[PDB]
Amino acid sequence: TLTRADWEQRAQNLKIEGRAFIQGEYTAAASGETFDCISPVDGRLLAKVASCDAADAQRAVESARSAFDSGAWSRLAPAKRKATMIRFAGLLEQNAEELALLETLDMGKPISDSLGVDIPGGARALSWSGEAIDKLYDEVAATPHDQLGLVTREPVGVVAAIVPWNFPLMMACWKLGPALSTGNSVVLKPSEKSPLTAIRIAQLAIEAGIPAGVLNVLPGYGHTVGKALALHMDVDTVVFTGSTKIAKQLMIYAGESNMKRVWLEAGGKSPNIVFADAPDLQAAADSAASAIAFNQGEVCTAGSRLLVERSIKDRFLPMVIEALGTWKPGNPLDPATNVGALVDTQQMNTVLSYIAAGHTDGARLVAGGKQILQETGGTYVEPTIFDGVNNAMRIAQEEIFGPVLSVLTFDTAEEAIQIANDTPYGLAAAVWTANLSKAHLTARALRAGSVWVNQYDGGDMTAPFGGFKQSGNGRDKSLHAFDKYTELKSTWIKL
Amino acid sequence: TLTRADWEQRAQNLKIEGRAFIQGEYTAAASGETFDCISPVDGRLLAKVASCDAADAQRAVESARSAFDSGAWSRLAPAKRKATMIRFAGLLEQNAEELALLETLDMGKPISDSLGVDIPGGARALSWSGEAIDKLYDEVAATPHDQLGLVTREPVGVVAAIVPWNFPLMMACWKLGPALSTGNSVVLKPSEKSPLTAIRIAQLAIEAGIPAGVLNVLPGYGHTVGKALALHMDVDTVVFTGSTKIAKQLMIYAGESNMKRVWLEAGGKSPNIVFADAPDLQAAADSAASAIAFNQGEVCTAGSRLLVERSIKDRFLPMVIEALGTWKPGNPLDPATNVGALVDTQQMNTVLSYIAAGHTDGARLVAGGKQILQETGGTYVEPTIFDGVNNAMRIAQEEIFGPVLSVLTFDTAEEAIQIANDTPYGLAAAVWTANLSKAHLTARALRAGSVWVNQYDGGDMTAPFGGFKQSGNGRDKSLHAFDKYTELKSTWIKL
Amino acid sequence: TLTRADWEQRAQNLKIEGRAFIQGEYTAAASGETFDCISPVDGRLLAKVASCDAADAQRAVESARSAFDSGAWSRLAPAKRKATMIRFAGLLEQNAEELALLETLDMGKPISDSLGVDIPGGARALSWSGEAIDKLYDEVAATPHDQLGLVTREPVGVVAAIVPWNFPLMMACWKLGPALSTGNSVVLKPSEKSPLTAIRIAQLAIEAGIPAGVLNVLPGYGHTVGKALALHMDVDTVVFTGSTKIAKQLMIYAGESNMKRVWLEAGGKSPNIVFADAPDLQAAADSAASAIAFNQGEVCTAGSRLLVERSIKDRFLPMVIEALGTWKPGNPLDPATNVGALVDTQQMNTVLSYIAAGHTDGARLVAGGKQILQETGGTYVEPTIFDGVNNAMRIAQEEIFGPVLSVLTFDTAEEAIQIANDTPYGLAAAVWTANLSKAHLTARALRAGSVWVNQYDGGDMTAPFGGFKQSGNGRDKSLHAFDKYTELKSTWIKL
Amino acid sequence: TLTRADWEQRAQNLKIEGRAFIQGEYTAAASGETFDCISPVDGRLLAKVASCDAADAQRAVESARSAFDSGAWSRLAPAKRKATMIRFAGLLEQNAEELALLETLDMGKPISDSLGVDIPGGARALSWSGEAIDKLYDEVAATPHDQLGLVTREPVGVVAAIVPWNFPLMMACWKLGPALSTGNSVVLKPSEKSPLTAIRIAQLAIEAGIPAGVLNVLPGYGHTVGKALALHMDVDTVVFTGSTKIAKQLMIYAGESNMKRVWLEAGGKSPNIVFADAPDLQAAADSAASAIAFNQGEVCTAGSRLLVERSIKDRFLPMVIEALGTWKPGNPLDPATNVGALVDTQQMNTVLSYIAAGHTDGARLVAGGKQILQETGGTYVEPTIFDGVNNAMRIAQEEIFGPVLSVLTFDTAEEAIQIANDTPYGLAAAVWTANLSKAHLTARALRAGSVWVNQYDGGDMTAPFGGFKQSGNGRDKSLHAFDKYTELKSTWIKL
Ligand SMILES: NC(=O)c1ccc[n+]([C@@H]2O[C@H](COP(=O)([O-])OP(=O)(O)OC[C@H]3O[C@@H](n4cnc5c(N)ncnc54)[C@H](O)[C@@H]3O)[C@@H](O)[C@H]2O)c1
């Protein structure tokens, strides 16, 4: 087990690749332009990263298209694609320490989280998806004797994947797993706030046996190369994870261009409903704190609204405060740290402004509330709780994407459901109760893509993940994720 | 069997409903405005139809939402929804003669087609979908012993369905069958060129037991009430059948509003590939003619590009010409008629302009090419064939939506495939060959949602139907149609 | 609603068919022999029924085989088979009053049960199965590009169905629905204790459009014609519902003959577990009584072992006694009657012998325990309860097939599960508890084909039904029932 | 690449384990008795192998049952069972040279086949099955609002697997893959003619992480320990691969004991149908020879009946003779050898007696026909062809299980199908034709579990494998194999 000093030495000794990757080779952007990749750990310069634009999108898509048409990957035997995807996952694990360190330096999450959650999670999405390839069957319809009706799935062709900065490698892998497994070529566009691991795994893909052109990586800004990919007339599908605002703009881009398929994973304001008859209130308290403090609250499914049955509120809230007190910001390179830096100054100022809005709209600060560790040259905020929140308050309605918890009360299950569903979002929700009927009926009534019962942040690769309403469309993970990267064909044969 | 005189008597004796339908009652538009519904068979006034706008969209959506929330239909037992949908289908059949007559008068297709194809096809979509409801199973994941992982589907809520004029009732039913079967409320917006059957079946739905508010019908223009539904902030999903141009606009509307799900069935320029080793050339010739002449060529999957192997071209083209000669425009109310009127003057001018374009771009007219029966006051054009067509010509690239055939030649299977896929569209295609390998390998290479082998216009309710590329996204018919009207939920329960 | 006098008039006015049915015609047995069909309601002669033997089995199998080979039904379009099966179900309903009367007279169940449960249940099995036919899809494997791998299902051919007397029509339909829907020819052998409804519906099948030879019916004894079918070298599959003893004998017959597939639905000793935290004790008490008294306890899944948590036992047992008191034997032709006659004298003696065994082995009689209504000439026994039962006692280990309840106690969930699973059987079980974890974990631990939670006798046509262990193999109802009547084929095509 | 001399040295240097394996340890049989394991390569003594009997079956099943009930494997997380199964497969590959050598020495197949087909094939069944575990989903029925209907699968408990000698390790793995993956305990009973690899992999299972008691191995005779397992009252399921005669006896044993589930893979007499319009006659000739000579014709799906369209017979048969001449018996330890020894003297004498019967019944010997290489001390027979065979001849009806081909002619497709289906068997069949319709219609009409088109011996792990009629019931490989090792449960929960 590596120490803080070990990680600090390794961080200093990294040579960091900043180039784009197109047709099997690292490359500068056509313009030669770069942007500074700055670490939120302490503000050090990590790398000058290629700043791609429309011209680079064009070259990457031409490369993607040529590779798809060659059939080198798209017509490779399923069992062979499986083997390659599993080797790809294996190379992530083999290079786990470097990749984890890049993630931590790039966007500030604790090294123990990068190493323990992100890298294994990314690898698992690649290998599980790979494992599934030849376990999938298409269909033969019930037809008259002189007909053979086949209903099959084929890869769409060229896929653009635009991903965010909060789980850079893992979110990339949630897309790459099913998209590559089904045989598509993918152009990956990582967040400008976290380009490094995406850039690095482009090389690993080649080493695993992914052909040149099949996985191209274009670092750069959303409003330049991201937009260019979404408007491209020869991209078949764009998959996206990010804000609801940008997600909507992608639907507009598709409409303005070639009617490409658009699949979105967007914001959340997930309600964590704790009933008086929860089987384990301490577990509910620990989980409620973890739900908002894990990864600095920079989680789409953060349990940012805590709904507590009023009769246990006075006992439960102090339990949640004490649990939250164990989540402490610190040096992300220290293995003992469980809360890291926020991704940058821009994000931190947004979070601080929402904390200010909590005060303004009349909520009661009961824990945290301040920026800390300023002397480090990094960006850190205390996990924060507001009590006495009404669901119409800004901190109840709007996604904060920091470790800021809103606490609301209710007195009936029906009110809990009404409050929980009172949102434009619908990514996740949780219910804590020992009652059989109340558990299933409440879960059934919540309009959310994931509903966790007597736990938070549940599910694994077998569980589809995605939004109701403005939290998105379509699902990541599970076999259902494959459907975003394929087209149905009905082949009706007269005999 | 009814005679022409019988159908003319019946046409005269219809009382035709023109009002919108909201919350279980026929109603004027809020503005009181109407538009004239004129028959293309000769020009008579059928009815003054309510011209709905945004205010009516709002009232209909409020009705739909309230109905959905009440659970009267959305939480009705699956077996009971099945019985209702089957009764709904049964009422279409019970009233087939009236509905077919309305269809024929409304948009000009032959009465024998309305009676023999449209009404049975529509009824079948409703009954088959109903039958399927309790044959569908959701999923239980493989999880650790202390977890129960449920993956289920739930109705999205409020669905707007916007449909075209070429198969008014049948297309409405393709949407209504699965949308209603899954438990949604639906707001149906029929084409302003063909509002009458949708208006009529609103009452039949009530009679079958569909609760008030669950199926609302808003006749009116695309740019008024259609647009209002697509921009509405409380519509969860819009499903669409129509032009690629408008389909794209709907993606923009969704992005501008509430990120509603958008499912599109759009245009086509389907290739009909006849190899020299086709098993039955006469069958191929008969189907090639039917593929362009049926429903006046106003068919999304019309075989508008006939690709013929050069070595049989001289023999096959005269066969296609002779077969096309049996398709003759005539009085739509005559049961002997197999080709009806074009939907309106605007449509006839478009077809005539494309025939002119055929000449201009250098193709050779070998059949038809002219308006006929002007004395009737109706709009009729001869089924038309151009030979010597290059795929770059306008008549080869652009959807005409009239009975105009382009004939192209090829020398190799590779060439046929390249030409076939050389289109922004991808709705359907056909292959004619007696060879096992060539049939399957060519079918596999064609980028289209339906591929018919040794037949044209194949499939039934078991066959998903929809586009690759700019022909749309998602599928109508089959069980896959249901997925457009539901959301996946992952319920992970800690035990 | 018909009165007792009405049903008695109708009983007198029946003309009852007693012949076998082969190749579209009613027929005597080859030997000319008959057996007396006597009613347990009072002892009248209903009909002299053909007593078939091996010669008749041979002729029926030859008819079945020829019909199968002709394709009249086996290669009939799926949608047409669906329509026929639905018409078949519709004829059962059209003739419900006659069929229910035949059932009640034949084996003694109350007329209100025959009319309200048996005939609708049978019709439902036929129509639901029919509806499902064209909703089923076979499979296409993930293969290399030069391979097409089809995995399809085909009817086995000739199916023998051997059924019992407790639900004569409904059990026959549980087999016929999926066996006929998949395209097989079926030879049905009803119990010699209840031949009449099977004989009758043979004609209804013809009327619905089932071709001659596809459904043959051979009334007669198990050891003659039943055995002949099970040993027949040209029967592909036998499906069976009856005793575990005979079920085992069928496996031996298959091994002695042609290795035909054997699917068994056999005996049961189902445990009904009521925890102290059951949500509704009165509902639990009412269901516990119904579970043993319904259809005279002549139910494979009768809740014959009531397991009660010791801490509610003193409160719950009087509730069960009072609820059982509402179940009173009476004239089966009286519509007010909720408990009918036992099927014959042999059955009554068996029940009385087990009541004697209850006393001998040391249990405590707390309700019923005696034959009643001897003056009627019929066979009736009081619903009976023994308290203080140990699971090692004969009444706890052996299936009684009468209305005799054994009451056992437990202190822990672990104990309840151990007792519940302490049986050679495994057909059904029930759990009553308001606790989420306990309900799912206990249901998971129970080795039984059906587990009902907070209800008894649950499920519908969507729920597969069948045994663990010596309660049988394979499942009736649901789509899984179809798999007993088809064979998988892997067609791997090199392209 | 190892030479013949290398393999001869390795064979001499093996230390061979002969003991049974129970509860994590090698053990003598209770009696202390052994049988001589003799090599058909040259007659050398390989090992004295434990000769288990009823007492050993009892101890193994008690061990299996205790392990299943402990949940160490049966309740282990799916993802963890997957990982263990993949490591298990990995250890087969890691020890491939030893395992391949054991197989070759034990039952005589060429070392290049053992190394290239058997070991990789066995490993692949284990890992593919393992990979599938968490890709499988169970079901949630469509039910009323106050019901939750779960349809799930659970392991049956204790599985007996009885396997033959022709593919000892691979057939064992076809059973072990799905049986262990679903969580069962397995008692494996290898053929007394080939016990060695089964004995050896028992240790590898433990090293991979399979808990003690979960995989027990009992070498010994069929009529002692095999029979004891099939009659055991606490074995839930027996799966079998072997002769039809013994397969039938297992059905009888189940009936005599506890009604255990019985799944059989039995004999074959597979027809290889070559039409005049086969796309590649040379390929058909090569494959027809391989179909009968591979693994000494000791293959269940050996293409033992060659049906050739009469018009190509005179040209085709010499092609088949020339191809068959490339398959030459030789030293199984020589890597160049492509035909090995027959398993023993008993088998060889059976084969020679069938060759004698070919002469007697009037067939024409056109190739091979004699025992060879007698001086080696081993058992070898020339690949043999009889022409002018009629389907009623013994060599056409009966399974020979040696390299003996029967050649038949036909003149119509209909006759080809009649002849092909004229058998009590139905394991596999093949069709060679370039015609689309004839390929699919003929394949559809053949009553066989596998149908190969324009190839022989096709399919991989995605293709279910097993018999129609007396070739067995149920399927090995694919996801369908899992169903033999699990039970369906319907859990209906009232809410
Ligand atoms: N599974 C999920 O649903 C999921 C997971 C993690 C994070 N998120 C969401 O991500 C957001 C935080 O991430 P973010 O700040 O990177 O979001 P963002 O919307 O600002 O950007 C996401 C990605 O889109 C790109 N982008 C920005 N503008 C673009 C444009 N005009 N056209 C094309 N691409 C453009 C960015 O460069 C980045 O790669 C939150 O709203 C959070 O809820 C969702």
Numbering used by the authors:
A (entry chain A), B (entry chain B), C (entry chain B), D (entry chain A): 3 to 497
Kindly provide excerpts from the paper associated with this entry:
Here, we demonstrate that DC3000 produces IAA and identify an indole-3-acetaldehyde dehydrogenase, AldA, that catalyzes the NAD-dependent formation of IAA from indole-3-acetaldehyde (IAAld). The AldA monomer adopts a canonical aldehyde dehydrogenase fold, which contains an NAD+-binding domain with a Rossmann-fold motif of a central β-sheet (β10-β9-β8-β11-β12) surrounded by α-helices, a mixed α/β domain with the catalytic cysteine residue (Cys302), and an oligomerization domain with a protruding β-sheet (β6-β7-β23). In each structure, two AldA monomers were in the asymmetric unit and packed to form a dimer, which then form a tetramer by crystallographic symmetry. Overall, the biochemical and structural data presented here indicate that in P. syringae strain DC3000 AldA functions as an IAAld dehydrogenase in IAA biosynthesis.
The AldA•NAD+ and AldA•NAD+•IAA crystal structures define the position of the active site between the catalytic and cofactor binding domains. The adenine ring of NAD+ lies in an apolar region that provides multiple van der Waals contacts. The adenine ring also forms two hydrogen bonds between the hydroxyl group of Tyr255 and a water. The adenine-ribose rings provide extensive polar interactions with AldA. Interactions with Ser193, Ser245, and Trp167 position the phosphate backbone in the binding site. The nicotinamide-ribose forms a bidentate interaction with Glu401 and the nicotinamide ring is bound by a water-mediated interaction with Thr243 and through a hydrogen bond from Glu267. Sequence comparisons show a conserved NAD+ binding site in AldA, AldB and AldC.
